[PDB]
Design a protein around this motif. Structure first.
Motif, mmCIF file in Angstrom:
data_model
loop_
_atom_site.group_PDB
_atom_site.id
_atom_site.type_symbol
_atom_site.label_atom_id
_atom_site.label_comp_id
_atom_site.label_asym_id
_atom_site.label_seq_id
_atom_site.Cartn_x
_atom_site.Cartn_y
_atom_site.Cartn_z
ATOM 1 N N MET A 53 0.831 -1.247 0.000
ATOM 2 C CA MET A 53 0.000 0.000 0.000
ATOM 3 C C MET A 53 0.855 1.282 0.000
ATOM 4 S SD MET A 53 -2.801 -1.711 -0.020
ATOM 5 C CE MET A 53 -4.283 -0.755 0.283
ATOM 6 N N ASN A 54 0.672 2.143 -0.999
ATOM 7 C CA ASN A 54 1.524 3.316 -1.142
ATOM 8 C C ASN A 54 0.852 4.596 -0.651
ATOM 9 O OD1 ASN A 54 3.207 1.742 -3.767
ATOM 10 N ND2 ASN A 54 4.244 2.680 -2.000
ATOM 11 N N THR A 55 1.643 5.664 -0.647
ATOM 12 C CA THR A 55 1.257 6.921 -0.031
ATOM 13 C C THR A 55 1.663 8.081 -0.920
ATOM 14 O OG1 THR A 55 1.620 5.955 2.130
ATOM 15 C CG2 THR A 55 1.528 8.370 2.031
ATOM 16 N N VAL A 56 0.782 9.069 -0.990
ATOM 17 C CA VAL A 56 1.072 10.348 -1.606
ATOM 18 C C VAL A 56 0.903 11.414 -0.536
ATOM 19 C CG1 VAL A 56 0.376 12.029 -3.305
ATOM 20 C CG2 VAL A 56 0.441 9.613 -3.928
ATOM 21 N N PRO A 57 2.003 11.836 0.089
ATOM 22 C CA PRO A 57 1.911 12.881 1.111
ATOM 23 C C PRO A 57 1.736 14.262 0.485
ATOM 24 C CG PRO A 57 4.174 12.142 0.871
ATOM 25 C CD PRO A 57 3.356 11.297 -0.080
ATOM 26 N N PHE A 58 1.185 15.162 1.279
ATOM 27 C CA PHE A 58 1.061 16.574 0.947
ATOM 28 C C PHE A 58 1.942 17.370 1.899
ATOM 29 C CE2 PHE A 58 -3.033 17.591 -1.448
ATOM 30 C CZ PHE A 58 -3.163 16.325 -1.961
ATOM 31 N N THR A 59 2.680 18.324 1.358
ATOM 32 C CA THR A 59 3.452 19.210 2.224
ATOM 33 C C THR A 59 2.543 19.980 3.176
ATOM 34 O OG1 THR A 59 5.253 19.368 0.634
ATOM 35 C CG2 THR A 59 4.964 21.224 2.150
ATOM 36 N N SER A 60 1.419 20.479 2.671
ATOM 37 C CA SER A 60 0.425 21.245 3.401
ATOM 38 C C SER A 60 -0.771 21.420 2.482
ATOM 39 C CB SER A 60 0.966 22.624 3.779
ATOM 40 O OG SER A 60 1.169 23.392 2.596
ATOM 41 N N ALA A 61 -1.845 22.003 3.021
ATOM 42 C CA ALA A 61 -3.018 22.399 2.225
ATOM 43 C C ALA A 61 -3.379 23.857 2.462
ATOM 44 C CB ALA A 61 -4.223 21.511 2.532
ATOM 45 N N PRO A 62 -2.680 24.780 1.811
ATOM 46 C CA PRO A 62 -2.891 26.215 2.130
ATOM 47 C C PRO A 62 -4.165 26.827 1.583
ATOM 48 C CG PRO A 62 -0.757 25.813 1.046
ATOM 49 C CD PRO A 62 -1.567 24.563 0.877
ATOM 50 N N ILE A 63 -4.788 26.231 0.569
ATOM 51 C CA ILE A 63 -6.040 26.732 0.036
ATOM 52 C C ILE A 63 -7.100 25.638 0.104
ATOM 53 C CG2 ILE A 63 -4.741 28.309 -1.492
ATOM 54 C CD1 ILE A 63 -5.938 26.811 -3.827
ATOM 55 N N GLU A 64 -8.326 26.078 0.352
ATOM 56 C CA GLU A 64 -9.467 25.183 0.456
ATOM 57 C C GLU A 64 -9.727 24.557 -0.909
ATOM 58 O OE1 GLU A 64 -13.650 26.731 2.085
ATOM 59 O OE2 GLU A 64 -11.963 26.596 3.514
ATOM 60 N N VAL A 65 -9.910 23.239 -0.924
ATOM 61 C CA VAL A 65 -9.917 22.478 -2.165
ATOM 62 C C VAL A 65 -10.702 21.198 -1.931
ATOM 63 C CG1 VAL A 65 -7.729 21.370 -1.599
ATOM 64 C CG2 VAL A 65 -8.413 21.592 -4.020
ATOM 65 N N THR A 66 -11.448 20.791 -2.959
ATOM 66 C CA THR A 66 -12.003 19.446 -3.055
ATOM 67 C C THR A 66 -10.988 18.557 -3.771
ATOM 68 O OG1 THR A 66 -14.239 20.322 -3.137
ATOM 69 C CG2 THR A 66 -13.954 18.025 -3.831
ATOM 70 N N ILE A 67 -10.566 17.483 -3.104
ATOM 71 C CA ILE A 67 -9.542 16.586 -3.629
ATOM 72 C C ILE A 67 -10.228 15.305 -4.068
ATOM 73 C CG2 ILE A 67 -7.436 15.306 -3.047
ATOM 74 C CD1 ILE A 67 -6.786 17.461 -1.047
ATOM 75 N N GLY A 68 -10.055 14.929 -5.317
ATOM 76 C CA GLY A 68 -10.565 13.626 -5.650
ATOM 77 C C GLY A 68 -9.439 12.640 -5.813
ATOM 78 N N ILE A 69 -9.667 11.396 -5.412
ATOM 79 C CA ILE A 69 -8.703 10.288 -5.538
ATOM 80 C C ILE A 69 -9.546 9.220 -6.246
ATOM 81 C CG2 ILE A 69 -9.259 9.679 -3.155
ATOM 82 C CD1 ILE A 69 -6.023 8.988 -5.166
ATOM 83 N N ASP A 70 -9.295 8.953 -7.531
ATOM 84 C CA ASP A 70 -10.120 8.059 -8.386
ATOM 85 C C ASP A 70 -11.595 8.494 -8.269
ATOM 86 O OD1 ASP A 70 -7.477 7.134 -8.436
ATOM 87 O OD2 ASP A 70 -8.050 5.336 -7.394
ATOM 88 N N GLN A 71 -12.563 7.638 -7.910
ATOM 89 C CA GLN A 71 -13.997 7.960 -7.882
ATOM 90 C C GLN A 71 -14.384 8.650 -6.566
ATOM 91 O OE1 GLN A 71 -12.455 4.869 -7.526
ATOM 92 N NE2 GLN A 71 -13.822 3.477 -6.493
ATOM 93 N N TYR A 72 -13.493 8.755 -5.577
ATOM 94 C CA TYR A 72 -13.780 9.386 -4.268
ATOM 95 C C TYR A 72 -13.459 10.881 -4.288
ATOM 96 C CZ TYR A 72 -13.639 4.439 -3.362
ATOM 97 O OH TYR A 72 -13.878 3.109 -3.413
ATOM 98 N N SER A 73 -14.191 11.691 -3.525
ATOM 99 C CA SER A 73 -13.985 13.154 -3.396
ATOM 100 C C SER A 73 -14.144 13.537 -1.933
ATOM 101 C CB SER A 73 -14.911 13.934 -4.259
ATOM 102 O OG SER A 73 -16.239 13.683 -3.883
#
Ligand code: VX5
Lengths: 237, 300
Positions: free
Chosen positions: B1-21
């Motif tokens: 199982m792999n990981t995509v880290p984020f440094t931070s989230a400075p702006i409000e955003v809807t993030i989708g990952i494949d069919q999930y949001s």
């Protein structure tokens, strides 16, 4: 795009163009069989390909043998039309090839476009004009050559006879479409009008009678009356 | 199982990952997505709260590198980047996981949706459609045009889908005009499958990728490509039986996943009516015809 009443003088400019009418390509008589079913018998047809500026008519006669053993003949007829028009263009010297081909029925657009892919600079266009070219087989000399053909044949005519010596191609086209509309609406009467006076003859090298300018005005008025009448006799008005 | 880290989230955003949001608030303590299934391509995508214009995202495969997201305040977007220091990455990710600052990719024991939508999609083919060779992942957005759209304007930012054109010399053999236009089998089997794609797996991969770009980014040229690739098969009288059976499964899952409210813009009435009711293959797509008639009977 499409050709209509707004861009009507475009027909008579100096860009070579051809009308293509396919309504007489596939022609049949419908009859009963001995078992009481219905069958068709094909008869010879023709492609009507006309330069409206010059009056040059390329009449490709479609002999019934082209349908032998084929299915879906009404669909095939459009494709055969496009094949023959493409062959005509390829046969003409480059400087005689049309810049535009205007089809009288929108169902000819895709067959013609596909057959003309090699000619990307020739525009294939529909029209919103309701042109009476189906009545071409009401012209006796054209019907005669089509019905007598025993094999595929192309015959060239000038559908304006010598009218362009005295009138412009706009006026000649308007006369032609008036005559053909009359023949389409009531063939017997139209033909009576055209041949009533036996002292006016059709030259051997012509399609229509040798009317003087004044006689053409009378004839043309008689055809308008016929079309208006039938339009009354039709809708009761 | 792999990981995509984020440094931070400075702006409000809807993030989708494949069919999930899911939604992330401005400056919320979000540090990425863990438990990403290995063995599939994936897409991580973004829509800013302040500007729903330009959905954008990144296609990636975690087997090809260690990837992370970092917001760029100059270009104004969340950017994917590759970390070449494997030890730095492992250490960063372990810290974020221990602190429970990552959302978990869902692990429903029954669900094959993403597999079914990406079965033939390969990252190596994505990278030929989306040309940016210095990165192992591929950026796509709502506005990117296709090579075919550009023929009818920046080439580097284009989608290089295989050009399909039914009224083209490629599609029409001289002397077989009527035959080839009315039955596209020679264009499908000789030109495209044998000639260009090499096999049906690559053809289905491009069809699946085009659909996913249409759905996730509203990318209009991708929708055109998806429909063209469907129509080319349906308009062929001679199609290998395994391809028809597989196409039926592919389209079934695409129609199943499509949001009900987006059917108006993502489905072309003409193509689907022709394909299900008029084409050579009108009787070959049982699963797709059934789901279409029960989910979108209006279009038909
Ligand atoms: O949508 C879901 N989960 C999200 C995944 C991304 C992170 C936020 C939660 C699941 C899908 C079906 C099962 N219940 C909800």
């Amino acid at each position: 795009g499409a050709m209509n009443s707004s861009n009507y003088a475009e027909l008579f400019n100096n860009d070579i163009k051809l009308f293509v009418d396919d309504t007489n390509v596939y022609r049949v008589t419908v009859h009963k069989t001995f078992e009481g079913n219905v069958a068709t018998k094909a008869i010879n047809g023709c492609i009507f390909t006309l330069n409206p500026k010059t009056g040059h008519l390329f009449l490709k006669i479609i002999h019934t043998s082209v349908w032998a053993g084929q299915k879906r003949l009404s669909q095939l007829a459009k494709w055969k039309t496009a094949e023959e028009v493409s062959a005509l263009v390829r046969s003409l010297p480059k400087e005689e090839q049309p810049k535009q081909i205007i089809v009288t029925r929108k169902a000819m657009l895709d067959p013609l476009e596909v057959h003309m892919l090699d000619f990307p600079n020739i525009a294939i266009r529909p029209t919103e004009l309701r042109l009476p070219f189906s009545a071409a087989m009401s012209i006796d000399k054209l019907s005669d050559v089509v019905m007598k053909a025993t094999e595929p044949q192309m015959v060239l005519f000038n559908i304006y006879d010598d009218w362009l010596d005295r009138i412009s191609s706009y006026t000649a086209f308007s006369r032609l479409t008036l005559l053909l509309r009359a023949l389409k609406t009531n063939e017997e009467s139209a033909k009576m009008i055209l041949l009533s006076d036996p002292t006016i003859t059709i030259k051997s090298y012509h399609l229509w009678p040798s009317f003087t300018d004044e006689q053409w005005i009378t004839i043309e008025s008689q055809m308008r009356d016929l079309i208006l009448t039938e339009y009354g006799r039709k809708y009761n008005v | 199982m792999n990981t995509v880290p984020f440094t931070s989230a400075p702006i409000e955003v809807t993030i989708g990952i494949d069919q999930y949001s899911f939604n992330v608030k401005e400056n919320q303590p979000f540090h990425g997505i863990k438990d990403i299934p290995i063995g599939h391509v994936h897409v991580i995508h973004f829509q800013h709260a302040d500007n729903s214009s330009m959905r954008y995202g990144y296609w990636f495969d975690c087997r090809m590198g260690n990837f992370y997201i970092q917001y760029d305040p100059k270009d104004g977007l969340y950017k994917m980047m590759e970390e070449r220091d494997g030890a730095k990455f492992e250490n960063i990710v372990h810290n974020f996981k221990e602190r429970q600052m990552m959302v978990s990719y869902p692990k429903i024991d029954e669900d094959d949706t993403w597999y079914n939508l990406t079965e033939f999609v390969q990252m190596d083919k994505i990278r030929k459609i989306v040309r940016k060779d210095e990165n192992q992942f591929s950026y796509v957005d709502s506005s990117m045009t296709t090579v075919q759209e550009n023929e009818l304007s920046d080439p580097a930012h284009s989608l290089n889908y295989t050009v399909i054109n039914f009224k083209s010399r490629e599609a029409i053999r001289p002397g077989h005009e009527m035959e080839d236009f009315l039955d596209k089998s020679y264009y499908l089997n000789t030109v495209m499958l044998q000639g260009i794609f090499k096999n049906s797996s690559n053809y289905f991969g491009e069809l699946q990728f085009a659909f996913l770009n249409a759905m996730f980014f509203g990318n209009y040229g991708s929708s055109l490509q998806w429909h063209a690739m469907i129509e080319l098969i349906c308009s062929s009288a001679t199609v290998p039986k395994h391809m028809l059976d597989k196409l039926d499964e592919i389209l079934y899952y695409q129609i199943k996943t499509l949001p009900e409210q987006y059917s108006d813009i993502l489905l072309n009435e003409r193509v689907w009516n022709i394909c299900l009711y008029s084409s050579f293959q009108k009787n070959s797509l049982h699963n797709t015809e059934k789901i279409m008639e029960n989910k979108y009977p209006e279009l038909l």
